[PDB]
Subunit: 319 residues, 4 copies
Amino acid sequence: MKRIGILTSGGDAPGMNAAVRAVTRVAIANGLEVFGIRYGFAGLVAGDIFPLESEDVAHLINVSGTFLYSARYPEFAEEEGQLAGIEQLKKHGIDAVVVIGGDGSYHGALQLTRHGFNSIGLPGTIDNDIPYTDATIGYDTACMTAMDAIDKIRDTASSHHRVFIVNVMGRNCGDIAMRVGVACGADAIVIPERPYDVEEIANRLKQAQESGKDHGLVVVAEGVMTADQFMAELKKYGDFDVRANVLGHMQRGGTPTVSDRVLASKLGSEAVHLLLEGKGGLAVGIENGKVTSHDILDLFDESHRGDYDLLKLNADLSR
Amino acid sequence: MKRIGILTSGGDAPGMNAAVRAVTRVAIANGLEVFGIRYGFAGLVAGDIFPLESEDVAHLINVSGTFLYSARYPEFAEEEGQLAGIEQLKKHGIDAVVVIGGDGSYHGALQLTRHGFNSIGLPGTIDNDIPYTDATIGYDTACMTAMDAIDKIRDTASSHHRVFIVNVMGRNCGDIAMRVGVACGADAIVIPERPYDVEEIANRLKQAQESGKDHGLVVVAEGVMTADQFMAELKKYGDFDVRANVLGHMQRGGTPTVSDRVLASKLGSEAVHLLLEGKGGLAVGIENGKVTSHDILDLFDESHRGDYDLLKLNADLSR
Amino acid sequence: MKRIGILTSGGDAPGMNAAVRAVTRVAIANGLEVFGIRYGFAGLVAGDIFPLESEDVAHLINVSGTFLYSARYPEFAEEEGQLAGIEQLKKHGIDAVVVIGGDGSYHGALQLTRHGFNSIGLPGTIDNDIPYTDATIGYDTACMTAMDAIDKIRDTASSHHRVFIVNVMGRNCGDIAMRVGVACGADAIVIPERPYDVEEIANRLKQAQESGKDHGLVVVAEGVMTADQFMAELKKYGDFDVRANVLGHMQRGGTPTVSDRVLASKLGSEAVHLLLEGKGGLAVGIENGKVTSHDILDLFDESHRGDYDLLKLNADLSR
Amino acid sequence: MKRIGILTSGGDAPGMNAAVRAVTRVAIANGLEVFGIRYGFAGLVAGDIFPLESEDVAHLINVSGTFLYSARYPEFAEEEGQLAGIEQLKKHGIDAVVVIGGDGSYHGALQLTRHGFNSIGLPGTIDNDIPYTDATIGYDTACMTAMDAIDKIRDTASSHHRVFIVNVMGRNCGDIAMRVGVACGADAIVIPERPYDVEEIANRLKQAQESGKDHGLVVVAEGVMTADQFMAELKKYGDFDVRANVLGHMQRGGTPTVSDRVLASKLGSEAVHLLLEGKGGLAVGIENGKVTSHDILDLFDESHRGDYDLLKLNADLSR
């Protein structure tokens, strides 16, 4: 193995750039040549591939987004795109690929591996929705973005004795909602993985109101329903002074946190090392607070488990 | 004059607390006793009035919201509420009132003044929509809140070559939209005070796309239409890769900026000084970069003028 | 057990308030009465003890510092202070105490336990210098504070092709320095736990300069030497364009991060639960990414192990 | 006039990039060709001059520092460097120059103008120390950087009933200190332009202590003395629980605020317009809240006047 490729795929996340940096620099420290692949698997098929020198990854560690760009490509799942991407890989002498993205992009890493181009999946997504990892790159930053936004909501809610219903991101995963909900002392948190009871939430808010609390907050994972939809259901059970906000795509951006930058650096390094020892078809992540890797095949049979105990904890904390 | 009251009215804004602090401390430095009035004119009528000692305004300068609370009161405009509030004022020996709020609350300051309780209006609102002032307390902070959020939107937009349509607050005023739009290099800014042309905006975005720009941004004042509504109109004129976000009530909260804290302190001090020299029925603000005051009556005949030249400037800057 | 006390001891840290909140609310949810103890063990001896109602811990989760205050007390280690504190405990009917602080305060938790007042140590310190825990409350926030500050240093360094030597906090622990160093792409990191070589660092900086890098950064744990002292040594080995900054006590403050707020909430809850099951003399923390507890006695025989592999990682990343 | 040059000179400041952007885009909108000049007057003499296309100023508005770099050049004041820079200007067909920097760099703009290359000075410095302007680009951001840092200091000070002495930047100007001091409720502010009295400050702190205040803060402009030096003098007049911090070069960096980005955009545009109407030897800035320009010669006879009334205001606010 002499040359490696890097691509970012799926929805961008803060810290992707730190991962590209880490892969590039650890690879160059081990005698490898590095190539950037733009627009994910889309540019792979198009042949948007270029040499990445060590100097080319300067001033990136603190930068959000992906400087390589990301773009969706359905035909890469099919043999048409596979072969076209592979021909492009061969054209540039690339032997192996690091794929930075969500578990969706891991499919492409596996297909590449099966065609003789060993590949590693690296978790870059805000959602933390990948099996066998407790963290994905971008997740901590999204949580901070949402927390800071909801802190501001709590300021205005408190001045006015208002209840807010707030959508956070997550896709079909409730991890952002639970973590941000606890961090922002939400009265209730509503997620796809665990049952919720609108009437019970209404009762919580009523009791809090009676106890003199000057604000209310329900954090609703976007995967359940919109804030507007939840607010409408809530209003059936009581007369509340309530507003609904949807935080939106700000959760995908911003300079990556200390945790995201370090996580991206650890995982990028691990990916290169796995490749150096002749491994492929692996996804790297965090288990039991340490860096681990698994066959991508094994992830496709499993589901992400979030920290659902946070709901029980917040049940005590919300008064 | 021996005793003064303070109330916050209308939608809260970052820096209201710094204003209460400034009024309280400058009044106490001049031998006056100070009383807090909770829930704006609502608590005035209810008699929610208490002594504010100098120690009671510690640890407030950096705190968002209003610790006195704000709450709407229609009946205070009428003679029913006026007399009830006045009786409450007399009950606590209060001679004068500082009213911190939007130009809507200035009505109450004037009515109070007409009844022998000299009052000063102090501009506390994020919207910057008050005649004869170039700044209101909360405006700079809202602009920062919106800028930081839209910076994050620009990060994710750029990774994906996406156009974003983004609503910012302002009520019926375009000041936030223009200032934030320029600060975030929006392709176009859409405000209530000046005509806009969806087809022309579409042409801007098309040209930018052709020139290789990797993101688009239209900042739409909430006073024009929703981001969803603008996006729908835009899609008529071209096929864009576009999303729509509404920033929401986060713009009302957050720790006040250096400018908001200093502005609140200057204006609070000015209010007390005006009262000391036996003035009433005045609103304080900023003109030609300095602190000024005007008869509240004069504001009711005028309209806020924003810096519309920013649209012409941004016309050159957006490529 | 019917009544519990809470105190914060040692240097304050962001998230202490979230811990008091979590202890108070989880205790009240389990039928316990809660009492605040001000000024750590100092106020314990003075008898500065008061009832903490559930409403009294509202609007605290996002607040830095400790609202109970912290203050040093040498005589509490001695039997004089112990007995005096115990008499005060008995005076208020308190059966058990949660001690939020550094491993130094754990001594007091143990002494209390030995006198029939079961106590739990909870790690509140920015330094992450406690045995058997991978995280202390305040650590993530300090890391963010330092990262954000050093990002700004990197901006100005880059405009001017300057090298910066920067002290971060940590006491005698290098954890902040390593984590922040990696997050800010330092050319070198200098810590008390592992050898460093000024000449080698000078060589790194020289090579980087030759390669066209427009900034330099050495992160020096305060536990090694001052930035001024390091800069002086560095200047012996080369002629550098260099400045030295000491970040200072800002690292101790600021609103706690999402991780610190959740960590404080988990650990506060765990402390209450341990007490409910009749345990005492335990310190709670994080091992293998999960909440654990250990006999305080066992910590006194051990040393904190930091993630020193970060130095090897950063060796590759720094070019 | 067909071609214009842009350079940044002196200490960098957040918003310089927004100014380069604004100059470049407004110039291109008016049919001019634009050239970047690197390393200030140093690269001008070296001939580090290149074409700046409109696309080349994308993704700069939010970026700190100067992407063109800044670097000191003594010989440009002399006729040796002047002629060499001029020959370089002629080599690239450049007719006029926008100089972004401190009033020190304005000397170079004037010399250029005298040699037939009309030039405009644009205020880029954090210090706000330029005659005939109430604001310089970078000033608001530095104030925010210092405010946010000192807020954190106030958190830790309050937990411990500590007094902090804190140096902020400013060079020989007290503007940052006064503005930040008021914004952070300093007990006292110490600046070069107005007398201070250490004994009186000590008395303030003593009285505050007696009144139950849980923190102290003295903001000392770096132009007076170091925080260490002030603390030493203070300790003569009383026994205080005191620490000293120097904020340092973080004040020079960070993403520019909404005000700095808009200010840079207005002033950059104004510079281009002045050049278009055949003007030269002018410095642009803010007076009476509006954009103005003056002969550079006139600035050399005047001194910056800061808002010293803030000291009298803070005298009332500090209790």
